[model samples]
Target chain A: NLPTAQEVQGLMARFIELVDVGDIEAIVQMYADDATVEDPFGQPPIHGREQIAAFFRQGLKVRACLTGPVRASHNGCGAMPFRVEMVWNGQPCALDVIDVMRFDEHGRIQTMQAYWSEVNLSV
Target chain B: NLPTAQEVQGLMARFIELVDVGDIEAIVQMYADDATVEDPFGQPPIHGREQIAAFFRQGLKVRACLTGPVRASHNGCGAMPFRVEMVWNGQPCALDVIDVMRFDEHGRIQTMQAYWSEVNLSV
Candidate 1:
């Protein structure tokens, strides 16, 4: 069955929650085994659980929070606006991001893409 | 060449400007001749310039504003959180939405999807 909007929103909420807590494994558990990720897009995608975990692990340093309401589609896609506070080369910085997660009918995230570029970082 | 993040962000900001002003034709000009749009997904996707413009024309009755910053992917995609104030059953209501747009290397929008469901609408 297609996920309810509330259900998709809940997953997105908990996704950032896991990110904030540095729970990479828990975050990975939310994705489908054959999922794909394109952080910042343009770059090559990270596929499967292991590489996905590494992707999250290499970027776990943060204190992120949702900046606005989460949005979910009738077709099982959800998106949100958020910011991540982290250190970059010994400088305190933040990244403003909007992530879009497309869920399978089973509610597992099948495609996750983070939309942000270098301009998103700083302050 | 792929669009720069600034360019992508620029078009996004201009897009809502067009939406708010009900500039249907201007918005149509930004999309590719062979673009596809799934305005809430689940529904049959609108394709090509004519149908895409038709889809937007039907929704130009609202007051829309960006709720937060636009997130630009290093690739040619951008997502934004916004809200539309309008009348539902003759009473005032608002819909929180996140829209993702993918641009071709030539800078024309290739795909557009709006993520929102009934739950996002409030009176």
Candidate 2:
């Protein structure tokens, strides 16, 4: 069965909180065993729990801010507008990002995709 | 001024029509002179109309199917879910993609970002 929109919203909120706190393990736990994640569209999709954890471990080290409320559907899909604020190579940088997620029957994330561009980054 | 939600939806529809017809030039024309496009996250962004046009010309050569209706916000942002069905390198290739667009005051696209992963592409 699909999760309610409110449930999806809550999940997204927890996700943001986890990211803010840099709890990479907790973030990985939110995905199913065979879950896939593609952050920022192209490079390659990370598959399975282990790889997903690895990816998040490296990525969640950066600061993230949820810029807006999550928009969710009753069928367990949602989008979140996000911003990352950090200093890279001694330069202050920020990026605008949007992430889309699909949930599984158990409410674990089945797929997570992020969209962003370097142009969205200000340094 | 922000565009009405209906206007944003109309623009999204026109975008799909252009993609379907493989009219890369028209697609480029829909963007502002200083637009940016980034497909599949990890790649560098394409800046300005010329580069954006170049990106689409190569991408739209494949067959794409719009999987659902465009979802738009009143503040000139929208998301589109789509699938590409075509043969690539002697193999049957299909991919699931989501594109998010932010429009400018003139209703031209200011930024276009696509989210997908190699895992989302299948033979």
Candidate 3:
């Protein structure tokens, strides 16, 4: 087993564990200094470390619960990959998300971006 | 445990099985047909049923071994989401992958796109 599934799973496990509890600093540390983040319907694209962290912080203040453990499959996880879901804002509203991310040489995340749904919003 | 993690794990298992086997017919069935796949390095965009299916077939011819069961994350999924990793060809080469996809109301894939790595590639 070159780098067995077990090893890869470890990476995912660690990444998620840190996020669920709202450890921004730790999460940020996992990312490269020049990382970029995009929140689909959030903003077209957010670039750089400070900007990415700021975007995530806005989410922390919004409604409570988090969603994840987005099990990946073989057909999935390829070039320019993204996850999908209709998110409820705790106010009985929903939005489609298409967040994206990238990693660097040392295995540090380098960029992330989320695309928010523009069609529907019950505000 | 209601819909236990095992159930979710199964979803990934089947999804991967079909892809690695190169069962386009079966894979197409799983898709809404209206499903879309985007290759970041590919054209600006490609859409529709037959079109998307055709796109994947093109990839099958390239020297490839497919990637992973990306694993999941609790804080990893939310309004918008994604995974990170660099893909390598059997040619001792690598490419950054940022594939994105979506599902329809019936749980069939609605869209997908691959963003090819542009920075470095030996000629």
Candidate 4:
């Protein structure tokens, strides 16, 4: 049976909590070792836990941060495996975060791709 | 009393359908005449109907577009009401979408602030 929305939401809450603490190691561990972080706008993809951790650590140095929640509405390509709405930051600088996480049988996040715009947050 | 979630969803569906069909006039009409589109990125806020219409018309020429759904989970600054989700594009290229719309009593959108990442879709 498919996971209930509540189940999905629980996972999302955990993901956000990990990210908020700047726990790069814990956050990276939650992702599959081979998972990739696509920072499509100029930044290269951070593949694997080492790189993902490295990327977030570097990001921390810049003092940039994110804050928001998971959206429950699901809409994307039907064949796509996952969906959630996570709004981050705020205006006059912000990005609306939407993320999809594919999980393994143990419910570990295997792959997560996040999308957003820097229109509000871009300095 | 506040509008029901279904009512919000109805307005959202209409928002998408109108945009997809390129019914600029109809779409703009859905907003108050002084409504603002807070692009916050390259283009400044599109204030008022004529300017908003102009922005969309010019934007159509760029061919960069949005595709996704309205997210239902709501979390943001509570004092500032409004929330929703929209995901656009695809993997190897994609961005999670979250948008908030504030409306006036006459039932017209007074302000709309959209957030997304060009990281996936950026050329």
Candidate 5:
């Protein structure tokens, strides 16, 4: 069965909250075993929850917040704009990103594609 | 050749500006002849530039504005969050939307997917 729009939106909110607190453990459980995360679109995806967990571990020291409301699609997909504040090479910076996620029947994230590039970073 | 992220971001800005001004004709030209638009996402997609123009004609009466910076991925794609203020059932309302678009090598939009749902409508 497909998840409802509300379900997708709720999941998005919870994920963002987890990200804000840098909860890598809680965030990893939100994805399916075979989930794929393509951060920045053109790059290779990080497959599986274990790898996804490792990928997120690097973000544990960062602060994140949603810049806008999470938007849900007619299908079980959602997108949200956010800012990830962190230090890069001894300088404080914030990166703006829009992540689009599709959910599985069990409400776990199936795929996540993050959109951002060089200009989105504010140093 | 594939467009650079900067080029993608620039086109996205122009497209948003046109959408804000409700410029249907100019908007249509930004897309390829075989482009597809999946507004609200799960419904049938609007195919071809001609049909796309007609689909956008409906939005010409709307007041639209980007709520955040246009985000470009490493690939030739971008996403933007916006609000469409319009009338629904004789009352004022606004719909929050996030659109993800992929551009062809020629820099024309090849596909566009919009994300939004009932809960996103505000009065």
Candidate 6:
């Protein structure tokens, strides 16, 4: 069964909380076993929750603050627009990121795709 | 009142159909009078239907094909992911774009933000 709006919101909140705290393991637990993630539109998909977890472990350095409400569709997808603040490569940078996630019947994220660009980042 | 899922889906279908056919005028009619469009996150928004229309008039050169289902929320917001194939700047280019639109009470798009990058475009 698909998650309700409130349930999807709760999931997003928890996921963001984990990301903000740099809890990569907990964040990985939010995805299903067969989940996939594509951080940028042009990149290849990272298949499986394990691979997705590793990707986030290496990349989840920034503190992400949600800028808008997490909107979810009845078809089990959610979109969140956020701002990321961090010191990357010894420079402080800010980036605008939007993530669209599709959830599975068990409420775990099945596919997570992030939309952002270097032009969206300021150092 | 917020539009229902079916209504939002219908709107997205019609919008994509117009875009597929390069119908600029019909596409402009989808926006509210005070609508804003930000194509690519780094740029400033083009405000009002007239400005938005002009922006699309130049951008509608593509033969956009919807690559996935249109997803909408109970909050009258919808997201559509698509691919555009066109001869841009004297070269055959393909782009992957995702547009997120917030609808007004009248069901016209109040804000349309496209999340894409030149990196997502290939020549």
Q: State the C-alpha lDDT per candidate.
A: 0.86, 0.74, 0.44, 0.48, 0.88, 0.74
Where model 3 places Cα greater than 4 Å from the true spot, the runs are A1-9, A61-98, A115-123, B1-111, B114-123
Tens digits of per-residue lDDT for model 5 on B23-75?
88899999999999998888898899889998888657467888898998767
Number of clashing residue pairs, candidate 6: 0
Query: Model 3, residue A98: what's the lDDT?
Result: 34
Rank order (by TM-score, best first): 5, 1, 6, 2, 4, 3
Local error of candidate 6 at B12, Å?
A: 14
Clashing pairs in 6: none
**Ranking 5 against 6 by DockQ, winner:** 5
For residue A11, give model 1's deviation from the true position in Å.
0.8
Q: What's the count of clashing pairs in each model shown?
A: 0, 5, 35, 14, 0, 0
lDDT of 4: 0.48
**Local accuracy of candidate 4 as per-residue lDDT tens digits, A1-123:** 232334445566676666555677877777767876654222355678888788767644112222333332221110111222233343232233445555554555666655333321233
Question: What is every candidate's C-alpha DockQ against the true complex, given to 2 decimals?
Answer: 0.78, 0.04, 0.08, 0.03, 0.82, 0.04
Residue by residue across B12-112, what tens digits does model 6's lDDT show? 77887888898888999999998988776446788998898888787775688666556555567666667778896788988776677778899899998
TM-score of each: 0.93, 0.53, 0.41, 0.41, 0.95, 0.54
lDDT by residue (A22-120, candidate 2, tens digit) is: 887899899999998877555478899999888877665367876655656546776666777777777878776667888989989999877554445
Answer with 3 or 6, whichever has the higher lDDT. 6
Q: Which ten residues in a row have the lowest lDDT in candidate 6 chain A?
A: A68-77
TM-score of chain B of 2: 0.89
- Scored against the true structure, residue A1 in model 1 reaches a CA lDDT of 60
lDDT (10s digit) by residue, model 4, range B3-122: 233444456567666665668788888888998886522235778999988976664311223334333222110011122223334313223334456556666778775533232132
Give candidate 6's error at residue B25 in angstroms.
2.0
Model 1 chain B worst lDDT run, 10 consecutive residues: B53-62
Error of 6 at A77 (Å): 0.9
lDDT of 2 by residue, B30-113 (tens): 999998886764357889987887787666646776665565554677666667776667677877666788888898999887
Query: In order of the candidates, what TM-score does chain B achieve?
Result: 0.92, 0.89, 0.54, 0.65, 0.92, 0.92
